[PDB]
Structure formats: structure tokens, C-alpha cells
Amino acid sequence: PLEKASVVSKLFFSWTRPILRKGYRQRLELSDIYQIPSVDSADNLSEKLEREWDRELASKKNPKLINALRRCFFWRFMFYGIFLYLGEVTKAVQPLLLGRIIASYDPDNKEERSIAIYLGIGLCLLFIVRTLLLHPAIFGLHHIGMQMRIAMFSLIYKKTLKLSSRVLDKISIGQLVSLLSNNLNKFDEGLALAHFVWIAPLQVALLMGLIWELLQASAFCGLGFLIVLALFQAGLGRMMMKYRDQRAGKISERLVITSEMIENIQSVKAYCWEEAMEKMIENLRQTELKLTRKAAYVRYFNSSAFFFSGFFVVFLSVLPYALIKGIILRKIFTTISFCIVLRMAVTRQFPWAVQTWYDSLGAINKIQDFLQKQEYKTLEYNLTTTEVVMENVTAFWEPVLKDINFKIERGQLLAVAGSTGAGKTSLLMVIMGELEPSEGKIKHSGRISFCSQFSWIMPGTIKENIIFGVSYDEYRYRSVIKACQLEEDISKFAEKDNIVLGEGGITLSGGQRARISLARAVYKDADLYLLDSPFGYLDVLTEKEIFESCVCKLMANKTRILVTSKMEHLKKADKILILHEGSSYFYGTFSELQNLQPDFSSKLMTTWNTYLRYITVHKSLIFVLIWCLVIFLAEVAASLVVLWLSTSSYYVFYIYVGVADTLLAMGFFRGLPLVHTLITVSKILHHKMLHSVLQAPMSTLNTLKAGGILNRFSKDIAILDDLLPLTIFDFIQLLLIVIGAIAVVAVLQPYIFVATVPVIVAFIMLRAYFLQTSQQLKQLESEGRSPIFTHLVTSLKGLWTLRAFGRQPYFETLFHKALNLHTANWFLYLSTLRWFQMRIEMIFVIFFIAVTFISILTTGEGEGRVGIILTLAMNIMSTLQWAVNSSIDVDSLMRSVSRVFKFIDMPTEGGQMTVKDLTAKYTEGGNAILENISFSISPGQRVGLLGRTGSGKSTLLSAFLRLLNTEGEIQIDGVSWDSITLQQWRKAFGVIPQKVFIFSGTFRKNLDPYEQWSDQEIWKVADEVGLRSVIEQFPGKLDFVLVDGGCVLSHGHKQLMCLARSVLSKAKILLLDEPSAHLDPVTYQIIRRTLKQAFADCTVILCEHRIEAMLECQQFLVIEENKVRQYDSIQKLLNERSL
């Protein structure tokens, strides 16, 4: 339903209370969330910018996108804007009324509590009015952010459909999906921070006047310090990027090893490289960590400077007043409350305004450059005659097809043939009109329909693909479905044919996708049917039956053009045109072809424990936090000791304890290694994680897909290493200052201690009440990201089919639904977040009112006791917001620690041979593929592995090395199964599989990861096995770096490399999996003619599909359902199974 509101509910955000009550109670659902307001809709947001950009494009010479984008949303932006300026100034007006409250308790006059309280109530109201001013004003800017963001993704979606192919030639597919993904986060939220460019100048200009001169340049010298501190932060900020930019080289060099690791785990297990590839990675870490620390240390200086500045910035400006003996107690307090506001504006707030403008404007320019590109103008086909006329049509891809001419009457078929990859598609691109001709004359009319070589199947049911635009006609649908022959495939889905397919179509067969492609092509009515290799992925017999029938049935008098290489159809066709690399043989008929080309014609015929588990896996981290706490307890006591009690020291000593930002704060001497410990924790976690990924069951591992493993191992631990250590220091620093400040206030005035307890419990109660929804809602934001990307990917695949049919309104209308689902979900996040930020200040203001009331009303004897509490209590809130704000970010990051602990917590496991009672399974208690198998192999025999072809030779090959669930008992010439552990057991075997493992390094390292083989014998073995030459045709000797995953080396070389690796291991038994299939006769001879003397007195097991391919194999093994038997020779086997 469409939501509504009242003046109160709109201000306070009441509608959150239902959804928080719902979310805290029951688990939420995507359908449960209510609809968007009628203003926020892609149909609205596109149309408004379309007309603005249209009139903008036609008027000026150089049309600005920023101008058109602003001109639509300029006014309400300012309307929301002014409310921020109205609040931001009142922060600076605030501490005047402080001065009067301090000025009340001085021995001058008999002025009553009235004079305090009548101001104090106004000062208390000033917070309530500012709370009501700001929180709507910030929400409006976020709300405009949606109008800015949603319209742009919808607008560029028009352009991406209407590109030229000349642009599509340039592979900017990653560059586009990168261009989209980055934009949303930076552009939407940051529109609030962009408004402070003109606020801060007026803020500092007002704050200049508030700082009274006192015969000196007090404000200018005070600011002049802090601008150099800002320049120092900018300077540290500059070199911070260099460490990222430099370290970005190593992380990629590390990632490539882990990517190759996760793909080929079975090889690493087979060869048993546990100690080899831990040190290899950890050496790549050991350097990177040392750089990573320096990136953190500068950030620590950057952060700590902000907390330390507060003392220096005031103290440097105050002492100049003493130059003409300026001494006063009241005026030194109010300057703190003036200066911290100045610091907030210039140091932290204003640089974000400079950052976000520069960051946003460049992004607005980036898409504007992409928007103005060459577009595909859809040509007309409304001319008379309805005959496809061409004259001298020729072009370039980047004369590609010269001498092109044919004239088809309505009825006749055109047969196209030639060499593959010689413009055979490119002709149909010119006939469609996507790729324009460089010269010639094209004149074809009538409606066009296209059938692609690539299988195009969109997300959804097969029904939507078959119908696709045109209305339902059942009697024609019966002939179409009968023609294309899907009813058999439908009847398999006995209930109904509404299987929800996605991108590509992994479930249905490559033929069935082509049948759907043909069905979609032949369903629609059109005057020209372009068939670009429909019958590609289909078996000849079933292909011929459909092909020969449909050609007769469909073509009653329909104009068709087919790109093919099937002779019978060429003979049955009306006219033929055979091409040869942009040079035609002839024009006409097969009858002419038999005369003109006789040779060619004749040739074809959050968990609370994870905090404890994270914090208690490192000793030094326990000591440093205790050392932080003991000093925190030590200093906060010293404050009480001081506050228990020329005179330029005594009266000026108040400021240091008064500015809690410097007093209650850590630094270089006693809070530096807190980060250092956190950096070591990630290294310790990584070390164990990587070790726990290896040493695990293959059944448990292989069930988890690789993309999840690689991504969680690469992306998350980097965030855990980089971002997580700062937010902890921020959280601790911001906690300590608040808990320290609230204590020392409560020590002096004891009745505040009663007022704290309802406030402290409310924070913990309300935050825990708030989180339950937020995380659950943000879960739907992450999931609801994918529908847009998955739709935008698929739409790019079937571009020509979309253009040819002309179904762009359908895709555009469907695309809006993907936006609306995301906006409906995302918009609710700001509304809940606003309510939390609304209430959190209302929890504070009642505490502040209570502290102010009780302090003013009760009998305060001293003059400082009034000022200190008021000065601390006034300026604290800014930190209190950051403290509660940070914990949510810390908790959200710390959510991803558990998933690493899931990876840590997973479990850890003569040439004669005799197998007995072997039973193996894929998953634990799964399908028994091998069942009670028992057989023997004699010592020093070449064995032929045979059985049920297609049942699976790899599954049996996995059972030897033990890469699945296994049961039974196997021995190698009386050697036991249980005795040698599964790591050391594999030392006996030697596999030469289809895949071969390739390091990103040296041939010295490839042959010997343990580095315990001498070069003499490596070279002597390399001579025997036959690597001598190819090793010697490279730079160095064995030191050549194998870049790009072994591009230079062919298969045969990888076979020799894998062979040499085995020969150096003195393996007894060897397993050969398809040598002759991938390799070529010369390589097969080159391998086999050295392999036999290399393993003359060794056991060999060859597996082949061809029976004659294992003629040399002496022993034979037959495999079958519940039986395995050892045959002595060909005469035993060949006659028994066959005859």
C-alpha cells in the first residue's frame, strides 16, 4: 500500500514503530515491506530528466549535464539547505548564555536564581529547536540523493541499449559494471556533506566576531595554528595514498597464487605440498604487513592530532591575553566552547565538503562523457516492392565483404555458405543494419526477424521467450510447438512448463536453447527471416528430421536467409551465394555450381562469544589494553586530586582538566601499540585460516563453491586487516572520553549519579532494540542489489535480438521493477536510521536539562564547580554521537569475523598391489559408486584400465589418492593401509592428470618446492626425462618466471614437467589419465618413446577408451557394477565381453 502521514508523525518518524515492533518480534520478509511513494518512481524520474536534457541538448553548443541536473533539483535543495545554516550558527550562539550562568555565581550583586533559570530554559530549548531543525534537513538531502541517483541509472539504461557496435568492439564491459557499482554509495549519502562549502566560511566568519580581540590577533593566531594542523593532516593524507598505491601491487601478486591454489587443491593434496605453499604465501605477507603498519601509523597520527589539538589550539591563543596581564576566570571557559566549534568546522567538517564535491563532480563528468556517444539509428523498411536489393555493399570491421549482390523475391530462399569467421555474420549485421557499409547501396524493406548463433535465453520461463511480445494464438502456437518440437521436453515437466531459468541456462541443454531460439524466431510474423547458424549444437539425425520438416512446413512462401554448410538444403534451395573471405565464387544455383565449380561440387559430395574468541587469541593485546586502562584510571584520579583544591599557573591549570579531549586521550607514548597488536592479530588469524583451509575433507570442501572461498579469503581479511583496527581505536577513544567525563562530573555533584542510570540503560536498551531491524534490513539491501545487475548483464547478451525484434519498452518497463524493489527496500533504511538519530539526542537533552537544572538550583558554593560541569556537559554530545555511531560500524565489520572462524573450525584428516572390499562414496553416506571391490595387480606390469565407459574413470582415480569418502582395505605388496598417514601414503603414487599445476615462479621452484634436491641431479634427470632442450631454450637455466599461468608451455611440456616431478620422487606406481586425447601423435610418440625405459621396472596403469591404444599393456582390468576382474590378455577379454 501507499503510505500516508500527519505533521507530528512526519517530523518524529512514527511509522518506524510498527516495523521495529514487527522486526523485533518476527522475522521480516521482502513481501512484508510496503510500497514506495508515487514521487519516487523510475517512470517519473526518467521522464523529468529526459525532457530537461532534451531541451538542454538542442539549445546550447556545449550542453552541461550539471546545469540540467541542478536546474531540476536546485530549489528544494536550498529549501532543505537553509535549515542546516539555521542550526549550525546556533551552536556558535550557544555559549553566550553559558557566560551569564558562570557570571551569576560571583560576589558582585544579589541577583536571584531567576536570572540564571530564565536564560537556562532558553539554552535548554536551543537544543530541542536545533534537534527539530537539523534531523529533517539532513533527511531531505538524502531524499534528494535518491532523486539524483535513481534517475541516472534509469537514464544511462536508455543509452546502453542505443549504442553503436563500433563502441561494443572496445571491451568496456567491466568498465561499465565498475562505473555503475562505484557510483551509488559515494553519490547518494554524500549530498548532505556537500552543502557545507558555504556554511563553514560563514561559521568561521561568525566565530571570528565571537572571539573578542583583547588588543591582539587572538582568533587569527589561533586559526593560523589549526590551518597548519589541517595542512599537516593533508600532508599525512597525501603519503597515505602512496602506501596504498604501492601495496596494491603486492596484493594482486598474492591473490594470483591463492586463485591458482583454490582451483587445483587436489593436485596440492596429491603431491602433498603443505609446508611448501604456507611459507611461500607467508613470505609474501611478511613484506606486505611491514608496509601495512606504516599506512596505519600515519592514520594514528592523523586521528590523534584531532584529539590532542584542543589544548594547543586554545592554550596558544589564551596566553597572549596575559601579555598586558589579562587575567580572568569566567572568560577562559566560554572560549573553549567557542574554539571546539571552530575546530569541528575547519579541521574535520570542511575538508569533507571539498572531498565530496571533487569526488561527485568527477563522477557526474565521467557518466556525461559516456552519455555523449555514437548511437544505433534503427533504419526504415517501409519501401515498396519488398525485395532485398543490394549494390556494391562493402565495409571495414574496425573491404571486409566486397562484391555483394542478390535480389530475393517474396517467396524464395537464400542459401549462404563459406569459410567460418569470414564475415558470414558480418553480412547479416549489414542486412540487419547494425554495422554500416563504407560504400554501396542497401534497399531492403519489410519487417525483420533474427535468429542468432549464440543461444539467447532471458531470465524467466520458457513460455515468455516463445510468446515474447505478440498476443497468444493457440492454434498457431500448436503448429509452432509441433514444428519446433518442444512438447516432448514439456511433457517431461509433467505439471507445467514454467521452469524459472536465469542467465545462460545451465539446466536445459544447448540444443533446447537453440530450439527455443528457433521457436522465438519463427513465432513472430515478419517479412524477412535472418537465420544466423541456428542448427549448430544439435546431433545430425534429430537435427535432420526437424530441419527437413520445418523447411517444408514453415516456408509456404516466406522469405528466408540461412547461413549454413549442409548440401541437401543447398540442393533444395532456390538461390545460393557462396562467399570466400570477401570474394564470392559465383551467383545463382547449384545447377550452375555443378558446371562452374565441378571440383568443389565433387569434393563436398553478531554472537557475543566471538568478541571473546577474537580478543583472546593474542597475549600482548591483553597487556596493552590493561596498560591503557590502568593509565586511564591513574589520570582520572589525578583530576580529582587537582580539583580537590602572579598566579598565572594556578588559574590557567583549569584548562587542561577542563578540556577532556586532551586529558582523557591516548597518544604516542602510551597508546601507540594498541594498533600494532591488532595488526599482529590479523597475521595470526590468516596464518591459521590458510592452514585450516588445507588439511580438510574433500567432501566438505568441494561442496562449498570456490567463488565463496576465494572471495571470503581475499576480500574480507583485507577489510579485517585494514579497516577494523582503526574503528576499535576510535570506539575505545570515544568510549573512554565519555565514560571518563561522565564520571568526573558525577563525582563533584553526586545527585547526577542517580540521573545517569536511566540514561545509560536507555542507550543499551534502545541500541539493541534498533539493531535487530537495521542488520535484517541491510541484509535485504545486499540481496536486492543483484536483480538489477543480473538483468543488466542478460540484456547486454541478447542485444541484437532485442534490437531486431524491437522490444525495448518491455526491457525498460521490466528494468524499473528491479529499481523499485531496491528503492522500496533501501528508502526504509534512512527512515529507521533517522529515528535512531532523533531519539539518541532526546535521550541526551533530558540528561543535560537535568544536569543544568540541578546544578543551577542546588547550593553550589564554588565558582569553578558550576563552570566545569557545564563546560564538560555542553560540548560532550558530539563525541557521544560518534561513540554510539561507531559501535554499529564495528559490529557490522565484526559480523565477518565469525565466517573466518567457520573456516578455522572445519575438521582435519616392490610394485605389487592388493585391494579388498573397497566401497567409496562421493558425499558422506552418499551414492555407492564403487561397492565391495576386490582385486590384485602383479609387480612390474603395464596395466590396462577398462570398464563402463562414461561411468567415471576419474572417480576411481580419486579413490587411490583418497579425495572422497572411502571404506575398505588396500595394500601395496603387504604394506598396511592405516599405518602410514594419508599425507605420507601419497609419496608412493605418481599422477599425470588432464590439468597440470603451474606455479608463478621458477623451474627450480616448480620441480622442488621443498628445496632439497641438487642441481646436478635435477639436470641429470632433466636429461633422462627429456626436458634438457626446452629448458635450455629460455633465459638463465631454471630461473625463468612462469607468468600468465604457463602460456609458453604446451601440454606435452607440462606432461614432461609432471613426469620429471614424478621421476625425481622415485614413485612405485603411476596413474595415466587420457594421454592420447589431448596430445597429438608426435607428442604421444615423444612421451611414450622415453616413458617406457624411464619406467621399465615400475608399475604403470593406463586408462583409454580405445582398446587398441592399450595393446602394449600386458595386464588388463575390467570394471563393472558390483564386480572387478583381472584379465591376462586381449584373447581373454575381447572375446568374452564381445562374443
Side-chain angles (χ1 to χ4, degrees):
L2 209 161
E3 72 86 43
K4 59 182 182 181
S6 184
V7 295
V8 179
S9 49
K10 193 169 184 175
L11 186 54
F12 290 111
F13 305 91
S14 79
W15 62 80
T16 51
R17 286 185 172 283
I19 64 166
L20 270 54
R21 184 178 176 181
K22 188 67 170 284
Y24 189 82
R25 177 173 160 76
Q26 194 168 26
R27 192 182 170 283
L28 301 172
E29 198 74 53
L30 187 63
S31 304
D32 199 278
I33 296 161
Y34 64 84
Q35 295 178 2
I36 314 162
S38 190
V39 175
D40 294 34
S41 291
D43 295 302
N44 289 254
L45 273 52
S46 301
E47 193 180 324
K48 291 182 79 70
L49 293 192
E50 186 171 34
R51 66 177 66 180
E52 290 275 27
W53 185 243
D54 182 40
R55 69 168 51 78
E56 178 56 48
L57 190 140
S59 53
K60 281 76 163 59
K61 190 175 178 181
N62 298 130
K64 298 182 180 181
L65 194 141
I66 305 114
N67 186 32
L69 187 64
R70 284 282 180 181
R71 278 176 69 266
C72 194
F73 302 94
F74 183 71
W75 204 246
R76 288 281 172 278
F77 180 76
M78 292 284 173
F79 188 77
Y80 285 121
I82 60 101
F83 287 104
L84 293 175
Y85 185 67
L86 196 61
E88 289 278 16
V89 298
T90 52
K91 293 185 181 74
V93 177
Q94 194 179 301
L96 276 72
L97 276 65
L98 174 60
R100 298 287 175 77
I101 298 289
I102 280 63
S104 184
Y105 295 89
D106 284 312
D108 296 310
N109 296 323
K110 63 169 199 302
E111 297 186 314
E112 300 94 321
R113 64 191 174 178
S114 297
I115 204 173
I117 196 68
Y118 285 133
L119 275 57
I121 195 76
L123 181 136
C124 287
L125 195 143
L126 257 292
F127 297 102
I128 295 160
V129 72
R130 192 165 83 267
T131 307
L132 297 170
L133 257 50
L134 296 168
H135 294 312
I138 204 90
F139 179 71
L141 295 161
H142 285 95
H143 187 248
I144 295 158
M146 300 296 152
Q147 301 295 310
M148 298 269 89
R149 192 193 67 181
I150 296 159
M152 286 172 61
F153 294 134
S154 195
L155 200 152
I156 63 101
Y157 193 82
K158 302 298 195 79
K159 198 77 202 194
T160 193
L161 297 166
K162 305 185 177 185
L163 263 59
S164 296
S165 188
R166 192 169 180 179
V167 177
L168 189 136
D169 186 42
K170 294 187 173 67
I171 300 160
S172 57
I173 298 159
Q175 193 178 357
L176 210 167
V177 301
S178 186
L179 171 150
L180 204 161
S181 187
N182 63 47
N183 189 46
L184 62 97
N185 192 24
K186 68 173 69 169
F187 187 53
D188 207 311
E189 297 164 34
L191 199 72
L193 300 169
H195 198 262
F196 301 120
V197 172
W198 72 272
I199 303 297
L202 297 176
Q203 195 70 10
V204 68
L206 204 155
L207 290 157
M208 275 182 182
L210 294 165
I211 297 289
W212 295 105
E213 295 136 43
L214 312 169
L215 295 74
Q216 286 299 332
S218 52
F220 295 98
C221 76
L223 183 61
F225 177 78
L226 193 50
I227 63 100
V228 174
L229 191 140
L231 184 62
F232 193 84
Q233 286 183 357
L236 269 53
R238 192 74 193 176
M239 72 190 293
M240 191 184 291
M241 296 285 175
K242 294 177 182 178
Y243 295 119
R244 292 175 169 179
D245 188 41
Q246 194 179 312
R247 186 161 55 77
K250 291 186 169 59
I251 60 100
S252 55
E253 194 171 40
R254 194 187 73 200
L255 188 275
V256 293
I257 309 303
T258 55
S259 66
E260 291 172 12
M261 166 56 80
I262 296 295
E263 293 288 311
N264 306 324
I265 298 160
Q266 294 173 233
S267 62
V268 170
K269 288 172 172 167
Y271 295 115
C272 187
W273 294 321
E274 308 304 321
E275 297 177 15
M277 304 193 71
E278 283 173 24
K279 292 181 180 180
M280 190 171 177
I281 299 294
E282 194 161 33
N283 286 311
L284 266 68
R285 295 307 312 262
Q286 188 167 25
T287 319
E288 189 175 299
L289 274 306
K290 194 153 279 164
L291 211 161
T292 311
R293 290 177 201 284
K294 294 199 293 183
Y297 289 128
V298 297
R299 190 71 176 77
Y300 182 85
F301 283 117
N302 203 335
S303 295
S304 62
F306 188 81
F307 298 101
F308 273 111
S309 175
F311 178 76
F312 290 102
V313 70
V314 184
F315 187 79
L316 187 140
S317 59
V318 170
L319 192 65
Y321 184 43
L323 188 63
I324 321 299
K325 302 192 179 295
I327 180 162
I328 191 167
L329 187 62
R330 183 254 288 185
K331 199 165 185 158
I332 66 104
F333 288 114
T334 189
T335 49
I336 305 294
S337 43
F338 287 128
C339 196
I340 273 60
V341 175
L342 181 274
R343 189 208 63 170
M344 190 74 74
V346 73
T347 316
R348 200 166 189 174
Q349 194 170 314
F350 182 74
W352 293 339
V354 175
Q355 175 52 223
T356 193
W357 265 72
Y358 186 80
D359 190 48
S360 181
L361 189 63
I364 297 159
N365 208 326
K366 187 179 284 187
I367 65 100
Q368 182 184 343
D369 187 43
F370 185 80
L371 198 146
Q372 188 162 44
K373 279 184 170 283
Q374 278 71 236
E375 61 262 47
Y376 162 59
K377 184 169 281 185
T378 188
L379 86 179
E380 57 261 46
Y381 49 90
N382 66 324
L383 302 172
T384 57
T385 317
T386 67
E387 170 157 45
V388 177
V389 179
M390 279 193 175
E391 280 194 55
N392 310 314
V393 180
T394 312
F396 273 108
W397 191 62
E398 56 175 37
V400 76
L401 292 169
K402 193 173 170 67
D403 196 50
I404 312 301
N405 202 295
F406 54 91
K407 296 183 180 179
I408 309 160
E409 299 185 329
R410 286 220 303 172
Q412 285 195 128
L413 177 78
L414 178 54
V416 184
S419 56
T420 191
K424 70 193 179 73
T425 312
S426 307
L427 180 55
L428 275 64
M429 296 290 169
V430 175
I431 296 158
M432 282 187 292
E434 181 55 41
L435 187 68
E436 298 185 320
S438 70
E439 55 170 23
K441 296 180 187 174
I442 300 166
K443 284 188 176 184
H444 68 279
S445 53
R447 191 177 292 180
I448 306 159
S449 192
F450 184 73
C451 183
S452 191
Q453 186 187 326
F454 282 89
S455 56
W456 165 233
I457 302 292
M458 78 203 177
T461 59
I462 65 101
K463 293 292 297 197
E464 293 288 312
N465 287 309
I466 298 158
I467 302 300
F468 199 61
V470 182
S471 58
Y472 190 71
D473 295 315
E474 193 170 33
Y475 196 79
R476 297 195 174 183
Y477 192 92
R478 191 179 178 182
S479 62
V480 169
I481 203 80
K482 177 177 168 66
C484 74
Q485 303 190 344
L486 261 59
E487 64 181 31
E488 294 189 328
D489 298 317
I490 293 162
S491 63
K492 290 169 186 175
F493 301 111
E495 188 170 34
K496 190 61 69 64
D497 56 351
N498 299 323
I499 194 170
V500 180
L501 301 168
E503 190 267 302
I506 62 164
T507 55
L508 301 176
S509 58
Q512 281 189 48
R513 299 202 301 282
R515 290 187 177 78
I516 293 156
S517 303
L518 185 62
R520 182 173 67 265
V522 305
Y523 180 76
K524 191 174 171 185
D525 182 46
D527 297 322
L528 194 73
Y529 295 105
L530 300 169
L531 299 169
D532 188 53
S533 183
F535 304 91
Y537 305 92
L538 296 169
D539 63 319
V540 297
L541 208 163
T542 317
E543 184 186 320
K544 284 276 167 179
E545 289 177 6
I546 298 159
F547 185 49
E548 294 169 26
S549 60
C550 75
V551 165
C552 295
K553 296 286 180 186
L554 281 53
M555 196 217 306
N557 198 243
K558 298 298 189 80
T559 317
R560 281 161 64 172
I561 308 179
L562 188 64
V563 180
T564 186
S565 302
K566 297 285 159 65
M567 300 74 189
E568 189 171 33
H569 188 67
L570 264 69
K571 292 173 182 179
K572 290 180 178 181
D574 301 301
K575 294 194 296 199
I576 312 170
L577 175 51
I578 310 172
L579 304 173
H580 190 87
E581 302 194 332
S583 298
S584 181
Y585 292 102
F586 276 104
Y587 305 98
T589 58
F590 197 81
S591 303
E592 295 160 54
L593 195 76
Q594 286 184 48
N595 298 53
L596 296 161
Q597 297 169 234
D599 295 314
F600 190 70
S601 300
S602 187
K603 183 61 171 179
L604 294 178
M605 291 176 67
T606 188
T607 50
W608 194 260
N609 191 30
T610 310
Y611 281 77
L612 199 147
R613 296 295 184 188
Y614 182 74
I615 200 173
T616 69
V617 285
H618 196 49
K619 292 194 167 289
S620 57
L621 188 137
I622 299 157
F623 291 113
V624 72
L625 65 84
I626 292 284
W627 191 46
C628 186
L629 287 160
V630 71
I631 296 165
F632 178 75
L633 268 68
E635 289 192 329
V636 71
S639 309
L640 274 43
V641 171
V642 171
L643 272 49
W644 195 260
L645 280 289
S646 55
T647 75
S648 299
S649 57
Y650 284 102
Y651 283 81
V652 181
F653 207 91
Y654 281 93
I655 197 169
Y656 184 60
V657 178
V659 179
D661 196 52
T662 316
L663 182 269
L664 301 171
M666 309 307 297
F668 65 88
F669 197 85
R670 68 215 183 282
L672 189 275
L674 187 139
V675 176
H676 174 78
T677 51
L678 290 160
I679 295 164
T680 53
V681 167
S682 60
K683 189 185 78 180
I684 293 158
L685 259 66
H686 176 79
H687 178 58
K688 289 200 296 298
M689 190 196 180
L690 185 274
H691 199 307
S692 191
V693 170
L694 280 70
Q695 302 283 117
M698 194 68 192
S699 58
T700 59
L701 200 292
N702 193 32
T703 44
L704 184 61
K705 69 194 177 286
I709 297 157
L710 197 152
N711 186 274
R712 197 185 299 181
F713 193 88
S714 61
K715 190 175 166 63
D716 186 40
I717 202 167
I719 297 159
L720 187 141
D721 186 34
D722 295 25
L723 280 65
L724 195 138
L726 300 171
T727 49
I728 288 168
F729 172 62
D730 191 47
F731 176 74
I732 292 159
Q733 177 57 30
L734 294 163
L735 197 290
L736 289 173
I737 190 173
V738 173
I739 198 169
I742 198 170
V744 298
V745 167
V747 170
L748 276 74
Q749 293 202 327
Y751 294 95
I752 295 164
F753 195 85
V754 177
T756 48
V757 173
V759 177
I760 294 159
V761 72
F763 286 125
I764 297 160
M765 188 170 66
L766 193 272
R767 196 178 74 83
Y769 182 69
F770 177 59
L771 283 167
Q772 288 294 332
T773 44
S774 300
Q775 291 291 331
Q776 193 166 210
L777 196 66
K778 192 170 180 180
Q779 188 183 308
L780 272 63
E781 294 182 323
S782 190
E783 293 193 330
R785 190 186 303 284
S786 72
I788 297 158
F789 279 80
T790 52
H791 186 253
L792 187 136
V793 165
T794 50
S795 60
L796 188 63
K797 302 303 298 188
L799 186 59
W800 294 285
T801 52
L802 183 54
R803 287 161 168 174
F805 280 70
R807 303 291 322 292
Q808 67 178 6
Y810 178 78
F811 274 63
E812 283 168 11
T813 49
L814 204 146
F815 181 77
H816 300 324
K817 191 175 177 182
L819 296 170
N820 290 313
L821 288 164
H822 189 249
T823 308
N825 189 67
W826 189 281
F827 174 70
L828 201 69
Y829 192 84
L830 294 165
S831 66
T832 54
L833 196 144
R834 276 303 97 200
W835 169 236
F836 187 72
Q837 296 295 314
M838 275 283 282
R839 189 163 175 179
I840 195 170
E841 191 158 33
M842 291 175 67
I843 293 161
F844 186 78
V845 73
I846 65 99
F847 180 75
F848 186 84
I849 287 158
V851 169
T852 47
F853 269 51
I854 198 167
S855 60
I856 296 159
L857 290 163
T858 57
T859 56
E861 192 170 33
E863 58 265 41
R865 187 161 291 179
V866 176
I868 295 157
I869 277 65
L870 291 166
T871 49
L872 266 73
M874 276 178 186
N875 221 323
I876 194 169
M877 66 187 78
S878 60
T879 60
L880 179 55
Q881 289 190 334
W882 296 329
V884 177
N885 184 234
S886 57
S887 59
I888 296 157
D889 298 327
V890 172
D891 189 57
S892 62
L893 290 162
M894 192 157 287
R895 190 187 74 182
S896 76
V897 176
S898 57
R899 65 176 67 180
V900 174
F901 277 100
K902 291 177 74 176
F903 268 88
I904 296 162
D905 287 20
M906 79 172 73
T908 72
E909 306 190 316
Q912 198 172 49
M913 197 181 177
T914 308
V915 177
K916 50 178 175 174
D917 306 325
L918 207 175
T919 304
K921 304 185 184 182
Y922 190 71
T923 51
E924 80 303 330
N927 295 121
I929 307 108
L930 309 182
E931 173 54 39
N932 200 39
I933 292 178
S934 300
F935 64 100
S936 189
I937 310 176
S938 299
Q941 285 282 312
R942 197 183 288 94
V943 187
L945 195 65
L946 296 166
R948 296 176 290 175
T949 188
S951 71
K953 64 186 169 297
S954 190
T955 319
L956 206 155
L957 287 163
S958 301
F960 285 112
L961 301 176
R962 311 176 76 173
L963 306 170
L964 65 168
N965 294 262
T966 53
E967 181 60 31
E969 192 166 21
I970 305 163
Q971 299 185 328
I972 300 173
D973 197 19
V975 176
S976 188
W977 191 244
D978 72 318
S979 63
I980 305 301
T981 56
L982 56 84
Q983 294 181 233
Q984 293 177 24
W985 176 253
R986 294 184 189 96
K987 294 290 191 296
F989 281 108
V991 188
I992 178 157
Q994 303 285 54
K995 300 171 188 173
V996 189
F997 194 68
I998 306 161
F999 288 89
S1000 296
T1002 59
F1003 294 117
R1004 298 192 72 177
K1005 198 172 186 76
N1006 279 239
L1007 298 170
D1008 189 9
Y1010 289 97
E1011 305 190 316
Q1012 303 187 338
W1013 290 120
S1014 56
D1015 296 312
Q1016 289 184 328
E1017 73 190 299
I1018 289 158
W1019 274 101
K1020 193 166 68 65
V1021 167
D1023 185 37
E1024 287 186 324
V1025 301
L1027 292 165
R1028 176 158 179 75
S1029 58
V1030 175
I1031 292 286
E1032 285 168 325
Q1033 303 305 140
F1034 271 123
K1037 278 189 176 182
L1038 292 163
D1039 311 325
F1040 176 64
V1041 180
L1042 289 163
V1043 303
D1044 304 320
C1047 61
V1048 299
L1049 300 170
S1050 66
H1051 290 262
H1053 299 106
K1054 293 168 186 180
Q1055 307 319 313
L1056 292 165
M1057 195 74 185
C1058 187
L1059 170 53
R1061 191 174 290 169
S1062 310
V1063 170
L1064 187 55
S1065 312
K1066 59 175 173 183
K1068 298 284 183 67
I1069 302 160
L1070 291 96
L1071 299 170
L1072 279 67
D1073 188 57
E1074 298 200 56
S1076 60
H1078 293 260
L1079 305 173
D1080 58 310
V1082 174
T1083 306
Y1084 188 79
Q1085 192 186 315
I1086 288 158
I1087 294 285
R1088 189 59 166 284
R1089 201 166 193 178
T1090 193
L1091 187 67
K1092 293 195 289 184
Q1093 55 265 38
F1095 304 128
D1097 197 52
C1098 287
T1099 314
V1100 184
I1101 298 163
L1102 179 59
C1103 195
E1104 283 280 13
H1105 296 280
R1106 304 289 175 77
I1107 200 77
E1108 275 70 49
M1110 54 167 63
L1111 187 143
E1112 295 290 315
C1113 296
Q1114 295 175 308
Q1115 196 167 212
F1116 294 87
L1117 298 172
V1118 170
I1119 307 155
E1120 54 189 324
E1121 188 63 33
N1122 310 136
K1123 194 175 179 183
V1124 174
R1125 184 164 178 77
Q1126 180 264 307
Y1127 286 70
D1128 300 323
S1129 58
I1130 295 288
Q1131 291 186 323
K1132 299 286 187 173
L1133 178 47
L1134 185 59
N1135 70 350
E1136 192 173 311
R1137 198 200 66 75
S1138 198
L1139 312 172

